[PDB]
Amino acid sequence: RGSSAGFDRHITIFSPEGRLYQVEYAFKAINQGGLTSVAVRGKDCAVIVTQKKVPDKLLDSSTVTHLFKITENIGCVMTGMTADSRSQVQRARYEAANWKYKYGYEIPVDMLCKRIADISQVYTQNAEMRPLGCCMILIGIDEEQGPQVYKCDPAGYYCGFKATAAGVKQTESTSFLEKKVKKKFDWTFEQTVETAITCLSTVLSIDFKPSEIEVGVVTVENPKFRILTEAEIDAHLVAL
Amino acid sequence: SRRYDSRTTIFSPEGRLYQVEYAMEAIGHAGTCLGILANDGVLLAAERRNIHKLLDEVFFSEKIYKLNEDMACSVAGITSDANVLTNELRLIAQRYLLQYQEPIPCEQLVTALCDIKQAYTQFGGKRPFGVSLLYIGWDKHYGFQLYQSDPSGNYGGWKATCIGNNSAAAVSMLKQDYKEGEMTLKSALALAIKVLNKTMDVSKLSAEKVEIATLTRENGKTVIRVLKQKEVEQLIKKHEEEEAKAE
Amino acid sequence: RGYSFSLTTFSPSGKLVQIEYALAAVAGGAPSVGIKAANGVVLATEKKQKSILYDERSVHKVEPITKHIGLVYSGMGPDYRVLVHRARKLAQQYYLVYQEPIPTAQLVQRVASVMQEYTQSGGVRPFGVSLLICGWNEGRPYLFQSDPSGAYFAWKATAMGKNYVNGKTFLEKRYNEDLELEDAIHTAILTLKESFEGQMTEDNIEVGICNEAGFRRLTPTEVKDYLAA
Amino acid sequence: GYDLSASTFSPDGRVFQVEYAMKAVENSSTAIGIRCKDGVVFGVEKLVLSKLYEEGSNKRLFNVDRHVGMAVAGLLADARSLADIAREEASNFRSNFGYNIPLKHLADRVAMYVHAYTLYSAVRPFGCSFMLGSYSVNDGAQLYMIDPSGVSYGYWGCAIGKARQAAKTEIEKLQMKEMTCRDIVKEVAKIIYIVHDEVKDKAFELELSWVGELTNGRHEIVPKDIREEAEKYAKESLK
Amino acid sequence: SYDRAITVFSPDGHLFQVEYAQEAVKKGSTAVGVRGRDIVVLGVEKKSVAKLQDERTVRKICALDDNVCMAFAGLTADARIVINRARVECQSHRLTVEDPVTVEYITRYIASLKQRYTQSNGRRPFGISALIVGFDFDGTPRLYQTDPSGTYHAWKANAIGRGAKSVREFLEKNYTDEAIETDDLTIKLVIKALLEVVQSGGKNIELAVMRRDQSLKILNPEEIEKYVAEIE
Amino acid sequence: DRGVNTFSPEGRLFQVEYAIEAIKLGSTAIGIQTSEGVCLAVEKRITSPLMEPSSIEKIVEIDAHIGCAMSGLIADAKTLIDKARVETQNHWFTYNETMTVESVTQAVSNLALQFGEEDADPGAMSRPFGVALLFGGVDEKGPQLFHMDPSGTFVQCDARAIGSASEGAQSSLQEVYHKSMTLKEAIKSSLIILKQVMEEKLNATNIELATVQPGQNFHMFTKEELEEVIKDI
Amino acid sequence: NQYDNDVTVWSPQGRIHQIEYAMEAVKQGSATVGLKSKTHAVLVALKRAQSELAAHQKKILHVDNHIGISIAGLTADARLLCNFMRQECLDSRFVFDRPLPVSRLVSLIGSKTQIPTQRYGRRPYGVGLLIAGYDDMGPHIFQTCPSANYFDCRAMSIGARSQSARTYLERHMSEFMECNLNELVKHGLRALRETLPAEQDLTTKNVSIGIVGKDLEFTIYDDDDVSPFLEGL
Amino acid sequence: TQNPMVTGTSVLGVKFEGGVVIAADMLGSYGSLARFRNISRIMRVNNSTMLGASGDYADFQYLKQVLGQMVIDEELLGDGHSYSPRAIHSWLTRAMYSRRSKMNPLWNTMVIGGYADGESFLGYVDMLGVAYEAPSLATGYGAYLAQPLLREVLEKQPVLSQTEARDLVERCMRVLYYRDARSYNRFQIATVTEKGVEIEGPLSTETNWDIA
């Protein structure tokens, strides 16, 4: 089963069964932070709710965030190692800029995901560097496809999803979402936030308070990435 | 990093390059490839290893490759490395024809490749090429010539040589059957079937399981021709008849 | 910088284990099938998602390289995406010089060259993906396989990934030299079906076809029709 | 052997070379930083190993720009190296954009250079953690701390070193948001004196710096007179 | 570029990679060189005749230039690289000085290269020892030896490769003004020296002579047989 | 395991300490500095009668006023003696003056320790030089003798013995050396100590002696002159 | 064990053993003392002779008219740093036509000596230096370490048995500021003596003195020039 | 710059007892056209040194940023040392020569005036690396119209007060306005003393007489 021969588990090389243990250990890093992220797409909206844990009252909470703006219309939720995460947020922000400069139009969210996944794959084929222990869930509005939730992983794998989750409770969140979407999808409507807030709330048994979660949203009406304020998040939490 | 380096280009306590020796063991598990020099021409007879029924024949040959208009080569070892070395052999030949405007002499082409092979065995930190090539050709200095090269970068001219599986047994039979100075491509294309019928223990030569190429000079032009399966089948048939007659 | 030493080296028995291990990753990949008929080639792959939360129309396993050349794979999809880009860039470099579509055999050789480099270069592992390339050129259909070692093979019908040996045995008993692309599409679906485990659907499988018109990926709707019969 | 390179994750998802690098910062004396409404005051417990050392040797409070100051902990050689990086990043920002670099941008850019030393085996993670602090009329007071991993966060009061936890309890008993720099300097001195362990750590020189409306947005060392009043208050409070 | 140190000192001050190279030279065929008065003779053991092998392609005696020629023991592939470097060097010398290289000039260059491969990153020492023999413009017969370490010395007669000690012991007791007065006597000295190691005798012994102001001459198998019988 | 530049727990550098052991396996070379000049003597250590003793060069000339005695890996020295000769000629071309012996010893000792495998250079040295050098010359300061080791350390020595029997010739040297000693007395003292340490019987062909004197240039004694001194020895 | 052969490997306790090893090399060097008054900075070095017939070695060096250095550790690494310091001082007097502030030079050395301690395949510098210079900020004595850390010192001793000297310096440091050059030089000589093998004395052959001040360019007093200072102890 | 663009005219300098004074017009001309008429061609390098520049204004804007950072870099060390007026002059000579040798010159003639250690510094630097120190300096057409007058006064009375120096500078500025066609009647006067560098705002030679 877990056969090893050589530096199979120290550098990115195939195990006797072709497994690449180093990438597998980079997926264990995503769960070392302790936080879970949930992203759901609706009929005209894509939402990214993440768990916010400000451990000390001395830390400025305005600086403790996992939601990022790659471009005015592309938003990101990063789960895993914080410093590795800020590195990929920067590479995404740069690849998105270089795209508009060379092609003249904003990068599609699928195209940003593929570029980041292609760079991540090179860390899996070269032994000089470790893979990055972070997952990026990107959300945007495509002009011909509407709401788009895409996720890339430390292995170089990217895919589009109706709803996704990353972190410690990724599996439990997947099951919660893999039942609502089956019945009638994440009830399409900007109130698709309720599905995400309830998914994170249920898996991480907790009644979130306006300051314990961060919510980012992109809509066909307002396509620009927006981070909801505690008052807006409180409105949704009070509604449910 | 010194920890993950294998140190391929280094000596052993007994003055031995083990990466080169291990690569040579790889060559000894590949399809038998035999070369016989005759007075009228030179021949290469390889054992086909891709013999599945769902394989499509889409090329001139699988083991034989034309490198010039007067030179051809068969390979035994790692196919991927052979594709690299055959492409380099073709460029060395074209680069010489550009500088002098004459076809490259055969030993000059073999030396160029063996110089590249030897460099991977002394410096670079990379594995050697696990491919031994049998080269056949004609030049206006020595005429029809057969050569063999090894992963060590060491080459040698031969009258008859074999590389691959059961190669030693073949060299033995060629040694007791080759008549230097009295070999015609007919008797050469005959000893080939005899050696292959012994080296290839897998049943009897089946024509689909073997490839035969001949280099001859016809009207001041070198012609390399891979014998058609009909011709190979006739050869295998004659060998069976002869063996039965001697019984 | 980076490691300049080969991570793939010869073992005492004369074998490169790293490529053997890359072929283990190719055999643990999802089942893939290729059939060269007389009027075209069909490339079919099992595309089963882990959940209903995956957009099946987001990422594709059957991908076009030129307009006559298409590819499928079995192994690591991230490593496949690298080889798809290089195949397209090599195919364009050919057109820029000879101003003609690249022969499928020339594309397989050029791609196989890149794969062999990752077995002898320094600091890099071999590609854990075997590719099936289909192309139409000179009014003839071509089907070739490419191994992680850099070795390429021409096939009339072949299977890769899980249950590839049993799949090749099925294709050996079903493949007929005189077939049409439509009959070929059925046999390819049957081969994947033998090793599918579930209900093959227009979204559980992905099929691509190459003909005189060129390469294309059968729409989920078109595949729905074939699965019906 | 999963802990010999920063290019290797353990079978659990951890890079132990970076955890070992931060053990070096926890073996250093404490450096505390407190943000108020008027700006930021930095304080360091500079242990004096040899009495044959001039006053000010091995200083751990640096001026990375006219408006930015850097407190450091762990290896001083690595820390001095990152001060050069911060000084160069600020210089190039002023030459390219033509203004004083925002502390968040300076923090983000330095944190990325630190994180670049946590991915390859050709280099070792930095063995130092630092706090960058600044004050501008448009941005106000800002305090950011960077760790050997390369994580940067903004704080109201941070503490790096061997007594970070005890120092944090003391800093958390303060209403910095309402206090001013002139009043914070005495509190920084009180905490550094309360966290210092004379029984083990022999003697130390209290180092104090600040940037604020009083310094007109300029990082500077607290005037000797103000530092002395602070130390007298500190010792008296310990009583 | 791979820049690891292959050749490094060991406790006790031993460069083992250089010692391993000399072990390869000891596994090589025996090469013998006798410096006479008007003839320098170089003879090599043709290990196995092979029977089906063109000898013109496996010759271990080569000519670096019109006045210089060398024999080698050890790896044949490393030797071809060294011979080509020395051949190019002799021509570059004739172009920058307009005179034939001296036997020791080329011996010094071959040694200096064989040395840099023992103190350069990413390289393994050359597993070959050479016997550079020629005639200086003054007309002095010259015999030099190079080691995988880059060390070179002049000799009246030496032997390299398998059975070097035995052959050199023989040459130590059989070298004299007497066994060097006649060109034929010089040739039979090398022949007898190899016959001490060579088992076949005559059939498995290549030999070459470079008389003054004359090109290298490869003695034909019949000529070698003539001396082998006279030496019996 | 350990790379070329790794310090020992005693902070010594292993490759530099194994190169010093490499010298202990070299032919003994003695150097004595007197007011009347400097004498350099070495043991040829011939291996076979068929070898040409002249081919063994252990005392070389860097310039008309500077000679060098080597012990250890002789091939390693070739590159070091080449640097010394070029540096002396470069000093002449630039300043039209003879280079001092300390300046030549400092220029060569700087090439030592300039080794490593971390892409230090395209033609970087991989290991230390396993050779010890005894530079003897006459500058504006008079007869001077300096000793350089594989550690890059150079010292001015009045009398110094390097090689296999240094741990014995140095004791004999410190028992027979007087600042007022003449060059002739020094030359005889070198041969006497060498004859003792040498395993073979000292003769005019198994030893090499050279001298740099205030007015005369570097002079390698020929068999005739060597025989005269060896007669008294 | 596996944490003490590279400088890019932190130990499980947050320590680079290779820097600790390189720091051992300096403690394995002849003691060197350095003290400063209000106007002068003196460097006293205990030269060590390899043999009774060998010059000591030269432990004090010139960098610029206002700066001089005493060495402890590998002399080759010391020369490499001395050249970097000499060029940085030449560059300063060529661009600003002003002597380089001594404090700023120490900052440059610590930056150059830190790089090799964080890169794979590179070794820490194995030289501890006591720098003495005069500037618009008065006399300065600094001590550099192989770890790349440097310290502004009122007085310092680096080398073997240097704790004996640092004990004397700590006891008498109070009177050094208001001291004449000869009183200051004799204080340093006394401390260097406290680092001498019991039965040993400070002769003119085993001692060197370097001095710099408001009106004195760095001077290295050796041989007889040390007799004035030694006479009176 | 191989081709100067917007340029400035003459800059004057005179050392007095207690410091130095520099004067320049507030105008940048585009080949005869007074295009930018409210620009300062004077700069406070530090508290002891001031710099006035003639020639390409973009080349001066480049020097203000490079010398400005060089001073910020030094004042971050807190070592107690600072660039002196003479050290700034040495750096500028090295910079102008370095660029002239690369054949990419900074088209600028600078006057560096400083005060340190009770000594007044006034140095001249051209684009070819020619530099010297003198009791008075006048770049451009002031070399032919203002320097003659300043040199006459500084010959009879070698040492001038601040009141005398300013009077003579204002007199030389008037003659430069009457006879320099690239001049302007708005100027700034900078004074370096023990108090530091002070720059006076838009001053006018309006004290012009036109008896035509």
Author numbering:
A (entry chain O): 3 to 242
B (entry chain Q): 2 to 248
C (entry chain P): 3 to 231
D (entry chain U): 6 to 244
E (entry chain R): 2 to 233
F (entry chain S): 9 to 241
G (entry chain T): 4 to 236
H (entry chain b): 1 to 212
The authors write:
Selecting the β4-StrepII cell population, which had the highest knock-in efficiency, we expanded this cell line and purified the human proteasome by StrepII pull-down. To visualize what might happen if proteolysis was blocked, we purified proteasome complexes via 20S(β4-StrepII) by StrepII pull-down in the presence of the peptide-like inhibitor MG-132 and carried out cryo-EM analysis. Distinct density for MG-132 was observed bound to the catalytic sites of 20S β1, β2, and β5, consistent with a previous study of the yeast proteasome. Besides the 20S proteolytic chamber, additional density is also observed in both antechambers, indicating that MG-132 can diffuse into all inner chambers of the 20S proteasome. Within each inner chamber, the hydrophobic MG-132 shows a distinct localization to hydrophobic 20S inner wall areas. Furthermore, the distribution of MG-132 shows connected densities leading to the proteolytic sites on β1, β2, and β5, which are also observed in the ALFA peptide density and suggest possible routes of peptide movement from the antechamber into the proteolytic chamber. Inhibition of proteolysis by MG-132 does not inhibit diffusion of peptide-like molecules within the proteasome, indicating that proteolysis is likely decoupled from substrate movement in the proteasome.
